[PDB]
Design a protein around this ligand. Structure first.
Ligand code: HEM
Length: 180
């Protein structure tokens, strides 16, 4: 599998709209899933002087367990786009497995407004592309994505109906973890 190629950040995006609040994934489009378990996700991205740091939460909807990461990377000159290396952590943010030089994800912000966002994520290990995901984001669980973000999905060449809606997965979130 190869990550989607026609991906660059929307120029003109306000970083104050993206690096704010927390995000919950309402809809995801996974090209070629790594495993067949389905996940819910929430995360809290912040930026300072070109360096992004984000607390990341995954809930496995099949097994009903959850895992935690902290990503860190630098913003590209293109706009709201960054490649992050990542640590695994426990629910209290104690570090377990350190970040390395071969595992990374590249996140590209396709749209972002006061309530909603559309991002693309390419997860890699070494020379291998492992995950390719588009995610529609909102600031509260089960909030409706804005018309502007729905337009962005259609502008990305995609069909929103072909995404998996997470509402039906029975997602559980750890909002203590994603605070800060
Ligand atoms: C609902 C949306 C999402 C789904 C369905 C999803 C799905 C997945 C899956 C299936 C894996 C492999 C897990 C396993 O090995 O069992 C994974 C790993 C990972 N994802 Fe997500 N993901 C989502 C959102 C995100 C977002 C928004 C980010 C970053 C902001 C992200 C970053 C990562 C990272 C860093 C890993 C590797 C974690 C590790 O191995 O320690 N994912 N994702």
């Amino acid at each position: 599998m190869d990550c989607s190629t026609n991906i660059s950040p929307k120029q003109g995006l306000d970083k104050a709209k993206y690096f704010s609040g927390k995000w919950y994934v309402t809809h995801f489009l996974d090209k070629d899933p790594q495993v067949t378990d389905q996940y819910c996700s929430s995360f809290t991205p912040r930026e300072s002087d070109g360096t992004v740091k984000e607390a990341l939460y995954h809930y496995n909807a099949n097994k009903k367990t959850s895992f935690y990461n902290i990503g860190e990377g630098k913003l590209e000159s293109s706009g709201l786009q960054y490649t992050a290396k990542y640590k695994t952590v426990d629910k209290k943010k104690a570090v377990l497995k350190e970040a390395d030089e071969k595992n990374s994800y590249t996140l590209t912000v396709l749209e972002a407004d006061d309530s909603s966002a559309l991002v693309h994520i390419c997860l890699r290990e070494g020379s291998k592309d492992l995950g390719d995901l588009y995610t529609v984001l909102t600031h509260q669980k089960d909030a409706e994505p804005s018309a502007k973000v729905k337009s962005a999905v259609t502008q990305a060449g995609l069909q929103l109906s072909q995404f998996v809606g997470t509402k039906d997965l029975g997602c559980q979130y750890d909002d203590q973890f994603t605070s800060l």
